[PDB]
Amino acid sequence: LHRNSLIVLADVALFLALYHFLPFEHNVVLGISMLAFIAVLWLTEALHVTVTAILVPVMAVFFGIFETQAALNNFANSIIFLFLGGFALAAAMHHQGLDKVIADKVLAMAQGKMSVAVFMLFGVTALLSMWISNTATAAMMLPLVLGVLSKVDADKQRSTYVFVLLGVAYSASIGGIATLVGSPPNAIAAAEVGLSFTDWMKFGLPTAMMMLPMAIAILYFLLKPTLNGMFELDRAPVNWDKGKVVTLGIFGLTVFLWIFSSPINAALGGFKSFDTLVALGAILMLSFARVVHWKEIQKTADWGVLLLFGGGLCLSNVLKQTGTSVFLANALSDMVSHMGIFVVILVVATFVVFLTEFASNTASAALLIPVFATVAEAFGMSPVLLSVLIAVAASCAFMLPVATPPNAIVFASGHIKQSEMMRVGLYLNIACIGLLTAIAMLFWQ
Amino acid sequence: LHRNSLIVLADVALFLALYHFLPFEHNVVLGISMLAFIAVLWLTEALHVTVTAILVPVMAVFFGIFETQAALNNFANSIIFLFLGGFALAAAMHHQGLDKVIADKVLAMAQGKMSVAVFMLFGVTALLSMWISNTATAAMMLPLVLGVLSKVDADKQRSTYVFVLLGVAYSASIGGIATLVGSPPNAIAAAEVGLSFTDWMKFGLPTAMMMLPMAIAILYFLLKPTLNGMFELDRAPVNWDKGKVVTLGIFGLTVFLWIFSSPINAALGGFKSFDTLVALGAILMLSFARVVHWKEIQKTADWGVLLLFGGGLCLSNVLKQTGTSVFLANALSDMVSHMGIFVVILVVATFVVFLTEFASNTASAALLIPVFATVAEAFGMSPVLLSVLIAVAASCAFMLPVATPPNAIVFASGHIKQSEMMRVGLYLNIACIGLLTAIAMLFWQ
Ligand code: NA
Ligand code: NA
Ligand code: NA
Ligand code: NA
């Protein structure tokens, strides 16, 4: 009776159809049919992203592709735990309120100027997003933005207070491209191609550094009248209490080890997934240092995303084991050789940057990273490029709301028009397809 | 400065001490030192049960016992997922309110008699606990019990309204011994020795059936004046709405497949951990049937317990790999042959039934099931007996509160005395040591 119940039944139909009608070796048929089935369920979101994730192994198992335990073992990949470490690290500094103090201390550095208020509001939202979340960084920023844009209250003077709203919802999404913790897509790429924390930063941090100015520039040079206004610094000030310095200290130490993981680990006996150990170490230090309780981490952690990671890896393995990766490689063989590597990575970048407007950031990564990385491997090319690309572009949702929660958070502020966002994002999309295809060409040799 | 911070440092000291001073082959020393370290941390609970759980692999890995990924793979054991299925199954019928209707419909079957009120209150708390939880079943029952014992309000007439309070807190714990979902210890035993759902029910359901009458009898024949009183059936009645029949239907179907897993699976091609597939199948049916949202399951699920399971399995493997299981087998060799199998299982049953009063139900199972099952295996005896025993006995906390949350839930009802509980439990403990050692002898050949 419901929309989604039908999408599911139409997908069950589609599967059954593809299954019986495709004219290939049995494994490829099964692999293709499953790919389509999942593809639909993640893009439509007829079932919850995480329920679909769980659907992957239970199919794999019933269709004899894997044994139950083999399939499940995916959900215990070391990146999954690295991400759970980053969740606990966030939980700590939120419960501790170290996110508020980093906001106040930087925001009140700007004395009383709306010019240097919004510019510091974007610079914080981005720096906080590197470690925290997107949905979380955005929802935490909204009250602090509405606090500032209350002195220039005239909402017949909209474009002042739309620039600073749309500004953070993008700064949250762009800041999420800086490190391996931040936005799930990054983690899905890292789990797929086997990246370290310090690996993904060598890619993303440059891209975030480039894209934040470029995005502010584009919002600016549409309609900004904000070189005017004054501050209302209205609320109780902040102060470092029972080891907000400790939470910072652990955080600093953790982030330090993540960066210097390569020499530190090598000069320790070369442990296997060092970054993950550092991440689990963080959870231990944070608990021994009494600084955060476990009930907190259990609330903060998006276990649904952690389960998603696994289902996506399971999918990747279903494609390999059924030879569907090799089959598509053969099928695209003539096409990709008739295209350039420029042409390809332009098509890819474009495709996702717009697909991510209609569907979930991570759901899109969870579908496309496996398909592309595994096909790239059948071509015997390093799957890293295509994977990192997809993950960055999947976090480039700038048009409508519903694209990301950050977009829909500043939108519910009952002010910003549907039409307005749809055209700043349309420029910023292309702007990125440029920047990405640009950078993706430079990171080659 | 805090109590627990010291326990930790004293434990770190103890480890360091044992590590340097024990006069054995290196692996045994490391294995023993770790066993002690963990043993302390789980019994004291200086660190959260779950943080200690995470501490297991991170040690194993740093001390070269396992590779990071190998150690982590433990957290994806198929029983872990079976238990997550049971969490989602509970989440469904609570959000749906099917637990309330099963309470009302059975409670209002008793017309207006306090005699047949409390007797049906225990019979429900037990039947609900089989599937739901203990902490959850107890906290859900408290308002329904205080609702009944408000007509005999005279609390100078205490022993009427203490019998019916202490009664449910035990019915919740006893009902948790009926099936593999219910109380974590059961799952830790099942993961260790490789039990199916229908396996653990063949053991526990008999034991729950026996122990519930035996426990009521003991509370009764201390001070019961409850053959008197009348009902206040005060609140809005219940009615089957948007598929509370569906939730029941799925539940029934799920529980059906779990029972008949053996012939159904055999007549399907013999899939690997069928019960787990059924459990994950439940999560899918419940989502397709739209009957429960994922945000619900994410709140309901005790991810901390799911992580605990893994840490415990990891420990078990640390004992095997270091040969600490074989070493203790050799060390207890002369003692266990000088004892009977009666003597042993009497000592075991006694030991836990009283240990579980001072420390966490599952934390105790997580420590003792590995140690015993692995030592039993070094003696080349089926580890099932000792494991199932420990898991049942670990759920036999009847003395002080703080033993289980169910005990401390009816206790905060500002009425029941410390002294009172401590002596009904002391009888019931021995009563069980009897019943268990009894039953444990019968389930032999
Ligand atoms: Na982020
Ligand atoms: Na999106
Ligand atoms: Na239970
Ligand atoms: Na206990």
Residue numbers in the entry:
A (entry chain B), B (entry chain A): 18 to 462
Quote the study's own text:
To uncover how VcINDY distinguishes between C4-dicarboxylate and C6-tricarboxylate, we determined the structure of a citrate-bound VcINDY. Citrate inhibits the VcINDY-mediated succinate transport, likely as a competitive inhibitor. In the citrate-bound VcINDY, the side-chain amide of N151 and the side-chain hydroxyl of T152 donate H-bonds to a terminal carboxylate (pro-R) of the bound citrate, whereas the side-chain hydroxyl of S377 and the side-chain amide of N378 form H-bonds with the central carboxylate of citrate. Moreover, the side chains of P201, V322 and T379 make van der Waals interactions with the bound citrate. One terminal carboxylate (pro-S) and the hydroxyl of citrate, however, make no interaction with VcINDY and project towards the solvent. More importantly, our co-structure indicated that the citrate- and succinate-binding sites overlap substantially in VcINDY, and that citrate inhibits the transport of succinate by preoccupying the substrate-binding site, that is, as a competitive inhibitor. In our VcINDY structures, the two carboxylates of succinate occupy virtually the same position as the central and pro-R carboxylates of citrate. In the citrate-bound structure, the pro-S carboxylate, which probably carries a full negative charge (crystallization pH∼7), makes no interaction with VcINDY. Rather, P201, V322 and T379 pack against the bound citrate and steer the pro-S carboxylate away from the transporter. Therefore, the negative charges in citrate may not be fully ‘neutralized' by its interactions with VcINDY in the membrane bilayer. This finding may explain why citrate is less effective in inhibiting VcINDY-mediated succinate transport than C4-dicarboxylates and why citrate preferably binds to the inward-facing VcINDY.
Membrane transporters belonging to the ubiquitous divalent anion/Na+ symporter (DASS) family move Krebs cycle intermediates or sulphate across the cell membrane typically by utilizing the preexisting Na+ gradient. However, like other well-characterized bacterial DASS proteins, VcINDY is known to transport succinate and other C4-dicarboxylates, rather than citrate (C6-tricarboxylate)1319. Our structure reveals a homodimeric arrangement, with each VcINDY protomer comprising eleven membrane-spanning helices (TM1–TM11), two re-entrant helix-turn-helix hairpins (HPin and HPout) and two interfacial helices (H4c and H9c). Viewed in parallel to the membrane, the VcINDY dimer is shaped like an inverted bowl with its concave mouth facing the cytoplasm, allowing the aqueous solution to reach the midpoint of the membrane.
